[PDB]
Amino acid sequence: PHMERASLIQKAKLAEQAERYEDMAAFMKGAVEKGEELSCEERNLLSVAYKNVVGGQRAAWRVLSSIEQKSNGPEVREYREKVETELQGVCDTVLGLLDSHLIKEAGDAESRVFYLKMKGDYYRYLAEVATGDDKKRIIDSARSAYQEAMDISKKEMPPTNPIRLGLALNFSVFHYEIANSPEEAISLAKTTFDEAMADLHTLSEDSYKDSTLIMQLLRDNLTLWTGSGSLRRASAPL
Amino acid sequence: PHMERASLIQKAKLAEQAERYEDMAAFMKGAVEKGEELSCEERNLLSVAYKNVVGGQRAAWRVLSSIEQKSNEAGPEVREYREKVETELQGVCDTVLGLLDSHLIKEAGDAESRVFYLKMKGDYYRYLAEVATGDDKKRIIDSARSAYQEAMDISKKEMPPTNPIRLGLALNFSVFHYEIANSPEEAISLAKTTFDEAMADLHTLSEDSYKDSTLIMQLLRDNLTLWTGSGSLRRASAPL
Amino acid sequence: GPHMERASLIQKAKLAEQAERYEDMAAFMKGAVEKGEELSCEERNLLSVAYKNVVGGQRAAWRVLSSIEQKSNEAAGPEVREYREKVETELQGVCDTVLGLLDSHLIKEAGDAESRVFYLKMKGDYYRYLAEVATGDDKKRIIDSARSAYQEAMDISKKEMPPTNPIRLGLALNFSVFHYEIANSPEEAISLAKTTFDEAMADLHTLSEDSYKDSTLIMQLLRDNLTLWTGSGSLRRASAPL
Amino acid sequence: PHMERASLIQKAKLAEQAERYEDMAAFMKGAVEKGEELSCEERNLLSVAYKNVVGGQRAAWRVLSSIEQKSNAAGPEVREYREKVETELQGVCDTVLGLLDSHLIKEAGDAESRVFYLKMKGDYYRYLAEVATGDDKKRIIDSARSAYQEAMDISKKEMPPTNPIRLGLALNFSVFHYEIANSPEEAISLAKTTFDEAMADLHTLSEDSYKDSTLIMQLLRDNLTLWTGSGSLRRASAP
């Protein structure tokens, strides 16, 4: 390690505690640029930082795009465009770090799934706002990243692993919202849930909370997408 | 025919594998009547047997009551047959409640067994309440409430929030609040509390209860989404 | 032109609020103030909301970092100090921006009592935020600048506004916080807080339905602080009066 | 002496103004035993009289029980005197519960009066629970809970969420949950639900109605901060 890198990682941990996500992101970018492999803890810092930064831009873009769609003055279009351009710049930064530093085709496989999933996520966020001729390319870039990640996770991780579950949840969202394949989405989400449910006896104690949380999100999306809400209430199985 | 306790339990296990729930129920009733306590495995056999028997009667009653409710817009066969299924269902609930009161419920044995039976008492009074329309309805609802309340009091002092009997109990009592007692707010807030307290204590869970606890936590979340109208909400992506 | 620009900026600040984009909202509201016209009651609230949210996050961060830094001085590690200093400098820059707008545009050009009190209260607030982080020889000056702004605002609000007015209540609540946390006058704070609450409670019959929610919300914050500061929160639970 | 019903009600109003609660209680017990329903104003006089009488006994019992618990044999005077106060308190609760069961609950016509008395029955069983110790405590706790639950069921169907008897009932049943039944979570949930459902319909009230209800909503908020520990949080500044 570089010690600049060690100091930047320490400052990213301080920025997380302080809920200063743009600083956290800047510190984690700097750390990625000052070294090779990130540890599991350091990969999560990078992801949390940029998740929170784009999360707010995406939430804003949705509000503005919703106002623009209903009002159809030039201020809404212009401001929606400002937020959109800013969001695109963050996604380009994350995708640049992944391609130039983090994604290693001959590296550790588990870390390769995390980054390839992250590459699919940030191309998917670009696809959420893309309306040009470039849209098809963006959608395909996200699909390839997720497909490459899915292929590795199936060979290398158990079906209860939270990175593998997270990956399948996000790729099903991609199918539903982006690729307009709601049936593939429902299918993948049901398969992921059922394969993880069958392998619950081999769930390690540390993965328990993260895996069951993501399995709940899969079940929540399945209910939303199939219209399984309004069905009869459940009582205990025993 | 070997109808000694050990043989009735063995036949109850065969009946389960064969999906012969009325035989299972009869074998388990017979095993309870030897005047002895049930193990955790044996309590589950008793519950599975009667849950399957009463479940088919309830499902049938709902179909018939639904046909009877639409029909008035009427031959007497629907009312008569709905009444036949109701009476039969009431007899099973009375059998289960009789076994619980005369043999199984004690003050006291171990907390998990006490809670299990009191939860079972609230469940079978709740099934009687589902079909009750007379002056006796209030009494039935109160009998279900007391059983669940006594069970809730023991489970809070004696069991961890992730225990599946404690989770199952809270899930069923929240259903009782929503459907039977017409207290949808109490139901939502019990379901949310149960889920949140179990979610915080997930580190202290075993391989045995893993599947049972997370399955019941999923049912709590499913009911919360149905009852709060949270279905409509934005799709989830990974927290990662 | 500037008149169409001013209108666009205020409209974008309303969009930025809906989108929870407070730094943009602040920038749009600064730009609108720099058109040199007075702000309406609605526009004053947009300005205040924008900068309250911006500085709110910086202050919350500063408190976390200062708390981590204080626990390391009892084997760190200069990163906490350095990062706490970064957040503080950034916070100071926002307070200086707000205080500059108030002094150069808003306070000098305020017509009515409600707008004049609003801005003087805001001046007291942002000097109080500078006082929250100040440890130099400049500390005493900052505290006094805050006190004078609040005192001038209190003098106008007592002559010109009813005791239920939410700007007057907000002012009193913040000046009591200044007394408790900044000036180390917890008795003056409890006093002021109790007096403000009691005088507003007596004049509740003369409250409009518009200001009822804003006034009762601020009266709730006054009694919440009174409970915290007097330790009355530890008292026996209430049951029904009949 | 003028001991006709209306004069007993007039004398109870005078005893309230004079803070003579044992006389007030005796005047309202006397008016109840005339065999007519109590009006809304009259029900409040009955409740105020006995809440003040039992309140002083409860406050005393708490002081004495605290001295007896701390005295750690000692002198027997504390136990004996705590027992005297306890027996006296139990007698007042038995008097109120006897009036409710023999005259007021049976004869109540409307929902508001039915709820009022059932809430009052839960309260006085809760006061008996405060001084009971073992399996005696079980018995009493469940009489309190049933009275409260029956009252809650009627108030939800028959009264708006801003009604002060419905608010008072929820506040007391939440106290029962927290202190007596050891269910701090449903106490906190019931109090927040009650506050939030009442706050959503406050615009409908007059100034008198608004005052009565907002006082009980403040007590719900006060208990919520005590029970959730929200009072120890960072001080508020203006929004």
Numbering used by the authors:
A (entry chain A): -1 to 70, 78 to 243
B (entry chain E): -1 to 71, 77 to 243
C (entry chain B): -2 to 71, 76 to 243
D (entry chain F): -1 to 70, 76 to 242
Text from the published report:
The 14-3-3 family of eukaryotic proteins are abundant, medium sized proteins (~30 kDa subunit mass) endowed with a well-characterized phosphopeptide-binding ability. The human 14-3-3 family comprises 7 isoforms (β, σ, ζ, γ, τ, ε, η), that form all-helical W-shaped homo- and heterodimers. To aid structure determination, we have developed a streamlined approach based on chimeric 14-3-3 proteins fused to the sequences of interacting peptides.
Thus, the C terminus of 14-3-3σ was fused to the N terminus of the HSPB6 peptide comprising the key Ser16, which is phosphorylated both in vivo and in vitro by cyclic nucleotide-dependent protein kinases A (PKA) and G (PKG). Two crystal forms of the pCH1 chimera are remarkably distinct differing by the relative orientation and packing of 14-3-3 dimers in the crystal. In the structure, pairs of subunits belonging to two different 14-3-3 dimers are linked by a reciprocal interdimer phosphopeptide swap, in the course of which phosphopeptides, fused to the C-terminus of each subunit, cross-patch into the AG of the adjacent monomer. Lying just outside the primary 14-3-3 binding motif, RXXpSXP, this residue has no clear electron density suggesting its conformational variability. Consistent with available 14-3-3/peptide crystal structures, in the pCH1℧ structure reported here, the phosphate moiety of the peptide forms salt bridging interactions with the conserved 14-3-3σ residues Lys49, Arg56, and Arg129 and a hydrogen bond with Tyr130. The comparison showed that the two different approaches provided almost identical structural information, with the Cα r.m.s.d. of 0.23 Å for bound peptides. As expected, the chimeric protein CH1 co-produced in bacteria with PKA was specifically phosphorylated at the authentic Ser residue (Ser16 of HSPB6).
